[PDB]
């Protein structure tokens, strides 16, 4: 069956691990070692087609450039994650997008902009600002909460749809 290699990227603390564990195991984790970079496989049905999701949960810049270039080359689609209560994490998105584009040597890479922690009242990044950034990239924007599950399946399935559309 078709396998989609998905990579979750974004600043430390945005909720990459929490989103991944919520997608895979259907539980919210209050803590997951921020330094651990692991991959997980799940069989799912997306738009009536049974497929394998192979998801790499990235740890960040504190590892060999050869490791980061390897997963950016192998990865078919990227979840670019920021937290809605962290403007610095939103400002960082363009850095992740740029690095993926360089490695893949392509102006058209399947990606989804994800604004996580949408359950938190203290928003510092508006939906409008995020939608404008995603529109300029020609990619979807989805707000998620790894805590409540809101938008979690939608964000990963939208990225699979972008790969199928590619
Ligand atoms: N309220 C809330 N907390 C979250 C959410 N996602 C992650 N967290 C918390 O934010 C912290 C960092 O999340 P983590 O998955 O480790 O981020 P990572 O460094 O991107 O992997 C942890 O304490 C998580 O429980 C979310 O959607 N809502
Ligand atoms: C907040 C995110 C964070 O601190 N991430 C993080 N910190 C330290 C490390 C890593 N991520 C990734 C793994 N390295 C160890 C390593 C492994 C192989 C090659 C070089 C470095 C530490
Ligand atoms: C994860 C994001 C999330 O929980 N969003 C969200 N939760 C509850 C509400 C809304 N979004 C929007 C609509 N209402 C609140 C509201 C906002 C503006 C005007 C009227 C009502 C519930
Ligand atoms: Mg993590």
Curated annotation (Swiss-Prot):
According to its UniProt record, this protein's enzyme class is hydrolase
Q: Which residues carry this modification: N6-acetyllysine?
A: 104
Predominantly, its location class is membrane
Assigned keywords, A-Z:
Acetylation, Cardiomyopathy, Cell membrane, Cytoplasm, Deafness, Disease variant, Ectodermal dysplasia, Glycoprotein, GTP-binding, Hydrolase, Intellectual disability, Isopeptide bond, Lipoprotein, Membrane, Methylation, Nucleotide-binding, Palmitate, Prenylation, Proto-oncogene, Ubl conjugation
Query: Which Gene Ontology cellular component annotation is one that this UniProt entry carries?
Result: focal adhesion
Q: Which residues are glycosylated?
A: 35
Changing residue 13 to D: reported impact? In GASC, JMML and OES; also found in a breast carcinoma cell line; somatic mutation
Q: Name one GO biological process term.
A: glial cell proliferation
Q: Which domain of life is it from?
A: Eukaryota
- N-acetylmethionine PTM positions: 1
Q: Which SUPFAM superfamilies match?
A: P-loop containing nucleoside triphosphate hydrolases
Please list the disulfide bridges: none
Binding of GTP, residues: 10-18, 29-35, 59-60, 116-119
| Residues with the N-acetylthreonine modification | 2
User: What does the record say mutating residue 146 to V does?
Assistant: In OES; somatic mutation
| PANTHER family named in the record | RAS, DI-RAS, AND RHEB FAMILY MEMBERS OF SMALL GTPASE SUPERFAMILY
Its assembly, as annotated, is: Interacts with PHLPP. Interacts (active GTP-bound form preferentially) with RGS14. Interacts (when farnesylated) with PDE6D; this promotes dissociation from the cell membrane. Interacts with SOS1. Interacts (when farnesylated) with GPR31. Interacts with RAP1GDS1. Interacts (active GTP-bound form) with both SHOC2 and PP1c (all isoforms) to form a tertiary complex; SHOC2 and PP1c preferably bind M-Ras/MRAS, but they also bind K-Ras/KRAS, N-Ras/NRAS and H-Ras/HRAS. Interacts (GTP-bound form) with MAPKAP1/SIN1; inhibiting K-Ras/KRAS activity.
What family is this protein classified in? Belongs to the small GTPase superfamily. Ras family.
Q: What is the protein name stated in its UniProt record?
A: GTPase KRas
- Species for this entry: Homo sapiens
Q: What's the name of its gene?
A: KRAS
